[PDB]
């Protein structure tokens, strides 16, 4: 990270071209003038210690290194040179974190649509839910391909933009932690797959909190290690629940890879669409 370079000619943005807004270590909303090729709303992560400055600077280098992907919040620029505080600028996703958003659509859900469709205008459907899952998996496939390990994958770190496009971000969580992470402090791509399994449960429970009614203590961890798992959420399909179980396999090397998840979820998305075309056609 630190060894990574920072190409200022390409990424540097003038501090006076920004107008800081309300709060979203701190992430805040702001208006950028000329960030691309005009005033555009952006999100800014800045410090609120040399240690912390190095961390943020390294996050910036890594995002640059990783590159662009539709399902990863896009980096737009940064203010790193002397004269002001260090600021990392990204795209702004208007609908916000997926957990809160799904929570707000609980009275606006139908498994699929049929005529008259306006009965379900802006409703969420199985297609939406599988689609959000498919998107995040592609994003993680992209990051794991580059040896990146998120370490905090959860609904709260997924953002929703225009046209139902979701993006993986990091505002920086025992309930999202793999057994090896809790007990051996081991973080790997495979522990990220475990977390993804919890993310799936969050999406298919429409933003509910994981392990409902369970106290997170010594017994929680013990039983997790021994094989106990959350039960199927209210809006899941049998296949999506099995995928969740596949993601929570006790043996890290037996969990599916993100490439396998992208392939699998894509297949479920297509089967769901075909089913939907028949429901729509017959009624
Ligand atoms: C309503 N809309 C909003 O509220 C809203 C809030 C927003 O907030 C932000 C602001 C700046 C950000 O910068 C990052 N970094 C970041 C993103 C992805 C990865 Cl994989 C990463 O990786 C971090 C590093 C690299 C791999 C493992 N990690 C430890 C770091 N996420 C951010 C989120 C953005 C858009 N809308």
């Amino acid at each position: 990270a630190e060894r990574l370079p920072y190409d200022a000619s390409k990424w540097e943005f003038p501090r006076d071209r920004l107008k800081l807004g309300k709060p979203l270590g701190q992430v805040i909303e702001a208006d950028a003038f000329g960030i691309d090729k005009t005033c555009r709303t952006v999100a800014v992560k800045m410090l609120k210690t040399h240690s912390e400055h190095r961390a943020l600077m390294s996050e910036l280098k890594i995002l640059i290194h990783i590159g662009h992907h539709l399902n990863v919040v896009n980096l737009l620029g940064a203010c790193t040179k002397p004269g002001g505080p260090l600021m990392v600028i990204t795209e702004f996703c208007k609908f916000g974190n997926l957990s809160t958003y799904l929570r707000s659509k609980r009275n606006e859900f139908v498994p699929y649509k049929v005529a008259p469709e306006d009965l379900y205008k802006d409703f969420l459907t199985l297609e939406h839910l599988i689609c959000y899952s498919f998107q995040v998996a592609k994003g993680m496939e992209f990051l794991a391909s580059r040896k990146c390990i998120h370490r905090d994958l959860a609904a709260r770190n997924i953002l929703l933009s225009e046209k139902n496009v979701v993006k993986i971000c990091d505002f920086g969580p025992l309930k999202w932690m793999a057994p090896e992470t809790i007990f051996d402090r081991v973080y790997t791509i495979q522990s990220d797959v475990w977390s993804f399994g919890v993310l799936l449960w969050e999406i298919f429970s429409l933003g509910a909190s994981p392990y409902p009614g369970v106290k997170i203590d010594e017994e929680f961890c013990r039983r997790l290690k021994e094989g106990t798992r959350m039960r199927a959420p209210d809006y899941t399909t049998p296949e999506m629940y099995q995928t969740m179980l596949d993601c929570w396999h006790g043996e890290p090397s037996q969990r599916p890879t993100f490439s396998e998840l992208v392939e699998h979820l894509g297949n479920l998305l297509q089967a769901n669409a075909q089913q939907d075309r028949h429901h729509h056609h017959h009624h």
Side-chain angles (χ1 to χ4, degrees):
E2 182 187 357
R3 296 165 169 179
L4 296 172
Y6 171 64
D7 171 27
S9 293
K10 180 179 176 180
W11 302 100
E12 195 74 15
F13 194 62
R15 296 198 173 78
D16 63 51
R17 290 301 188 77
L18 293 170
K19 268 194 176 184
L20 307 178
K22 70 176 195 295
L24 298 171
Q26 81 203 89
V27 177
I28 58 184
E29 184 182 308
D31 272 301
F33 180 64
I35 192 70
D36 57 7
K37 67 184 186 194
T38 311
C39 182
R40 170 177 186 168
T41 299
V42 294
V44 182
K45 178 183 290 191
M46 61 197 275
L47 298 174
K48 179 187 172 170
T49 301
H50 184 274
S51 168
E52 270 149 349
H53 181 89
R54 182 184 295 174
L56 190 45
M57 260 305 284
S58 296
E59 183 182 316
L60 168 62
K61 293 178 181 177
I62 302 183
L63 285 170
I64 291 175
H65 182 61
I66 293 174
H68 168 75
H69 187 280
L70 181 66
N71 299 128
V72 182
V73 76
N74 302 186
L75 171 69
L76 304 178
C79 308
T80 70
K81 289 182 168 177
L86 170 62
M87 300 181 270
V88 177
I89 312 166
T90 74
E91 55 177 316
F92 180 72
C93 302
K94 59 181 299 182
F95 299 96
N97 87 85
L98 194 50
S99 184
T100 304
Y101 177 82
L102 300 187
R103 192 105 38 64
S104 73
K105 309 292 290 181
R106 294 202 174 174
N107 283 168
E108 289 166 335
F109 176 96
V110 289
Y112 54 86
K113 303 181 190 192
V114 300
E117 302 179 11
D118 42 45
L119 231 178
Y120 328 108
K121 181 186 171 186
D122 291 322
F123 270 47
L124 280 182
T125 65
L126 280 184
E127 169 161 291
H128 287 77
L129 300 189
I130 297 168
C131 189
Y132 296 150
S133 305
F134 177 55
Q135 287 183 64
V136 174
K138 286 195 291 183
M140 288 307 294
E141 171 180 48
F142 176 80
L143 296 172
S145 292
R146 294 166 175 59
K147 298 195 289 184
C148 292
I149 305 167
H150 194 290
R151 294 174 65 108
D152 187 31
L153 188 53
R156 54 179 153 65
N157 275 324
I158 301 303
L159 306 181
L160 176 61
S161 182
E162 314 291 15
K163 287 89 162 296
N164 291 113
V165 175
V166 289
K167 303 168 181 299
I168 297 165
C169 77
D170 187 355
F171 288 87
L174 273 178
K175 295 196 295 182
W176 286 263
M177 290 169 73
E180 66 275 7
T181 309
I182 290 174
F183 292 94
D184 302 325
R185 283 186 77 182
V186 173
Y187 289 78
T188 73
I189 289 178
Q190 291 70 52
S191 58
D192 268 1
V193 173
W194 175 291
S195 295
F196 180 78
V198 179
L199 165 63
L200 290 184
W201 189 93
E202 284 183 280
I203 289 171
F204 290 88
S205 70
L206 286 196
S209 185
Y211 302 100
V214 174
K215 340 204 210 309
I216 306 171
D217 54 10
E218 187 181 349
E219 288 302 84
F220 165 79
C221 301
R222 179 178 73 65
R223 295 196 282 204
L224 194 64
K225 172 220 283 284
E226 304 205 320
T228 300
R229 303 287 186 268
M230 288 189 264
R231 300 169 178 182
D234 298 340
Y235 313 82
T236 188
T237 57
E239 291 82 13
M240 207 65 70
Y241 185 46
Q242 185 57 60
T243 290
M244 284 178 214
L245 292 184
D246 294 330
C247 288
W248 303 323
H249 195 298
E251 189 68 41
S253 68
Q254 296 309 300
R255 299 179 192 152
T257 63
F258 282 118
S259 284
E260 295 172 330
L261 288 162
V262 171
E263 186 54 27
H264 185 49
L265 296 165
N267 285 165
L268 295 179
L269 184 59
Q270 290 195 172
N272 187 71
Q274 183 177 60
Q275 281 162 35
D276 280 16
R277 290 197 286 282
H278 280 72
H279 304 318
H280 190 94
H281 182 265
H282 292 94
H283 304 91

